[PDB]
Write a protein that binds this ligand. Structure first.
Ligand code: ATU
Ligand code: ATU
Lengths: 344, 341
């Protein structure tokens, strides 16, 4: 079988060129930006994904510069990056994860079942950790959706991926409002706001949580108008002031439709509570990623005896860094449970 | 079975209600605005669709107001309208029922690995452009042109534009929301968030429907606006800074993909030519609905001997009114062929 050898720059270490060899190359994605292949590293035999993008000589690649400064257990890792031609192409060698929340959720959905809540807790918590981390650098993902949430079935580790839309948001600087996928767009983006903040990622994460609980997207619609109608059916009509906070300079008025009426009976009240605090019209009213992690809905993950259904221990959930906690250090008293603090 | 009698107001003419009875009611759709039922008029036996929408009684329904004013062979007709309740009040629009949609017809061919015969692409697109020329002559923009809102009668090949729930009279200098129009059919200026767009957004949408019928699939798919723009750039090429200015409100620099390379071989050159004149970055550069009708791609419909594959004659295609031609009267010399009475 064919073996390709390239010389690449390490994704995060010091600039020490490495000779990398991979085989069994095969396509696994064709997203507008470029091609996403899967390959097998000759030596270790580990699987990797290679995102190949056309590199504009005009400017430096934004995804690459962002990926180079990230190092977190819940963010897909950039192992190496090198250029080729076959025309100038940037290749990003990333860790390959077997599943996605999108595929897992679809499997349960067409089997008429919902994902056990223990998994909803583990997945959402890890997503909020990854967001707390990138937001601490002022970086907004801008495309949070089930397809960009990679999962390892056995360990239950979740990893945020695809930073092709990510960007450092600077106060006072305008940003395009046409990023983010259909069902997951915050109201301010639908209204065309250009001064939105990182809280749009929080709205998107809230849509993912509601979707895992419901078994289907919570705010579907092929047009922004249809999406807003679904949002209004649940949150109610926006006050003129809330519309002002979403920013952008006439819908059939409806009242506060209980969130308890939204999900099936049995749904943990804490899950419903969390959704209501994430999916808020006013962007400043939504919980921050870190506050979300500290929410009572995730208390079970902080119990000393918690275990995965398959018997294994839960993945690392409390190894927080100073960087991660910077938005609100005091939260550590809740985020790091007593038993994770025993010195032994 | 069950018979329902209401006192309904005729869609057109003097506001004079009459008793109307209907039977065989059944849900046939669930839209965001409201349920859509089918029913049979007890007198005529004709089938009708009834759209029920919650009515904020302190204001006049815009869809109703626009519909009461429209009368065209290629626009679904508002037969009657009436109110009912469930302390909540509903406006019920009694519209003519049409058996098919371009969406369903196209899907049928698509999953059978075939494409709709071009004679139908011509008939359907021409009728859609006639309906657009008509509503635009009143300054009304549909704002949601897509396969699902194009009704079809299989036997006569008559097409009727429907669902005016997003339609609005566009007034120069007045701002309009940019979040109307469905995903694959949104003009670039809407994707960029323009608030001063014109009726030409309907033309871009119609161009997307034409390309889709020729291709067998949507031409500018994508779950985010960014993805949609990439697909648009792959075909039209990168927008000049000026074209971006005309659309109003950091992309790679790809060059124009020859339109002929876009469709399968065999595709009529005129079809390709029409698409390129509809799908233009600069909104003022796109053909007007009336100019589109007069395009050479539709010449076959103007041939005296044209017939539908099923042997029947084509539907009415030349009965233009002064209102319809107002944007450019001289086009009548092309629009109404010599043989046309
Ligand atoms: O590591 C990957 C690569 C990968 C998947 N989806 C993605 C979306 C975006 C990107 N990306 O690099 O941007 C990679 C991936 C994907 C899909 C199915 C199964 C496994 C899986 N895993
Ligand atoms: O006249 C209708 C009503 C109807 C269809 N689609 C629609 C989309 C919008 C509206 N509307 O009133 O807005 C009515 C309809 C539809 C669908 C399948 C088969 C026939 C058909 N016919």
């Amino acid at each position: 079988s064919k073996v390709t050898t390239v010389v690449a720059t390490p994704g995060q270490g010091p600039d020490r060129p490495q000779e990398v060899s991979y085989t069994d190359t095969k396509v696994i994605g064709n997203g507008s930006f470029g091609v996403v292949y899967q390959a097998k590293l000759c030596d270790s035999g580990e699987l990797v994904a290679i995102k190949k993008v056309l590199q504009d000589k005009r400017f430096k690649n934004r995804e690459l510069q962002i990926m180079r400064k990230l190092d977190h257990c819940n963010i897909v890792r950039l192992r190496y990056f090198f250029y080729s031609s076959g025309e100038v192409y940037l290749n990003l060698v990333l860790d390959y994860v077997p599943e996605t929340v999108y595929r897992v959720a679809r499997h349960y959905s067409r089997a008429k079942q919902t994902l056990p809540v223990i998994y909803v807790k583990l997945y959402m918590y890890q997503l909020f950790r990854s967001l707390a981390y990138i937001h601490s650098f002022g970086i907004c993902h801008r495309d949070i959706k089930p397809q960009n949430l990679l999962l390892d079935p056995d360990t239950a580790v979740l990893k945020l991926c695809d930073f092709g839309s990510a960007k450092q948001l600077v106060r006072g600087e305008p940003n395009v409002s046409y990023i983010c996928s259909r069902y997951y767009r915050a109201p301010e983006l639908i209204f065309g706001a250009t001064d939105y903040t990182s809280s749009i990622d929080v709205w998107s994460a809230g849509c993912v949580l509601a979707e895992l609980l419901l078994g289907q997207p919570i705010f579907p619609g092929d047009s922004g108008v249809d999406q807003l109608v679904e949002i209004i059916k649940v949150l109610g009509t926006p006050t003129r002031e809330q519309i002002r906070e979403m920013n952008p300079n006439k819908f059939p008025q409806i009242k506060a439709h209980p969130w308890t009426k939204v999900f099936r009976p049995r749904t943990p009240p804490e899950a419903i509570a969390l959704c209501s605090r994430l999916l808020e019209y006013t962007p400043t009213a939504r919980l921050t990623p870190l506050e979300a992690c500290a929410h009572s809905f995730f208390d079970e993950l902080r119990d000393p005896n918690v275990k995965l259904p398959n018997g294994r221990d839960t993945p690392a959930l409390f190894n927080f860094t100073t960087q991660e906690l910077s938005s609100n250090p005091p939260l550590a008293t809740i985020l790091i449970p007593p038993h994770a603090r025993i010195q032994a």
